[PDB]
Amino acid sequence: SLVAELQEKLQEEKAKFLEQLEEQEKRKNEEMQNVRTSLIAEQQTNFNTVLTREKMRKENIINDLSDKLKSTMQQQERDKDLIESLSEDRARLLEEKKKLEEEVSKLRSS
């Protein structure tokens, strides 16, 4: 029966059409994910070039300021070591000079 055969081929083609729609929904979603992933990767690469370019636009001033500040701070630490020693040693010399002046005075009037 040809009627039979076409009744069956109708139902099998309807089912097949349904599954090609579903299979095509899935490939399109996989293509979008693929495109999305590719865009993210290529932008994020380009951002990197831009940031590195921008890192250097002020590198020469930071490196200048940094090395002046290192050297005037090293000179400040020497000066603070010197000032603390000179200040303390003078104070001792002052006391020692006063007690020597008293010793001289007493010996002169002995």
């Binding site: 603070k80 000032i83 603390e84 104070a91």
Partner: protein, 104 residues
């Protein structure tokens, strides 16, 4: 710059300063006293006799009537004696002196 030979008034002067911390000394002028380039504030041991006996000093700031200099901690005595701020004129004349204090 000492020698061997109350127009300025110190205020806010504490009796004890923290050892190894910066100390900020506050003062104003009085009786139309006007400062000069080479006037200095020194830290003196109480009982000193000559302005040569400063422990340490700093030139004044030239110009709110308030005035202040910042003594860095390494300008400061590290013993327990009594000390005192003194404003010394360009001509060695003492124009002010504060109350005694210690670093403790």
């Amino acid at each position: 710059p000492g020698s061997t030979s109350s127009q300025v008034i110190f205020n806010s002067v504490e009796k004890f300063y923290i050892p190894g911390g910066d100390v900020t000394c506050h003062y104003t002028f009085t009786q139309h006293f006007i400062p000069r380039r080479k006037d200095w504030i020194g830290i003196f041991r109480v009982g000193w006799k000559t302005t040569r006996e400063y422990y340490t000093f700093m030139w004044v700031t030239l110009p709110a009537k308030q005035q202040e200099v910042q003594f860095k901690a390494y300008y400061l005595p590290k013993d327990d004696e009594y000390y005192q701020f003194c404003y010394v004129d360009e001509d060695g004349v003492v124009r002010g002196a504060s109350i005694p204090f210690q670093f403790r």
